[PDB]
Amino acid sequence: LAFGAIQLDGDGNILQYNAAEGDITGRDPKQVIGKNFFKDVAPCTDSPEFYGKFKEGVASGNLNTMFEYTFDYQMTPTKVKVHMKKALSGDSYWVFVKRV
């Protein structure tokens, strides 16, 4: 499948969410955009190795990291590879997701 892609602001609010990501997770993009990724849609990502690294990277202005993660919240459990990095646009961060 095509990468899943999510664009977040620095607080973790979902600004963009593509169809491929919804195919991985079962989420309808229009129902999650505008909600908080870490505190509402994806609470299983509220961990030091995901959310904690996100916040560090937002703070430092240097976010660019890759890691494996399990997406198992209100979906058939799926191992994924995550790449999060700062965007070019203002107050924007990308999360790219591939099944592994």
Ligand SMILES: *C(=O)/C=C/c1ccc(O)cc1
């Ligand atoms: C854990 O709560 C993960 C949930 C999640 C991951 C990625 C998404 O796009 C949606 C939900």
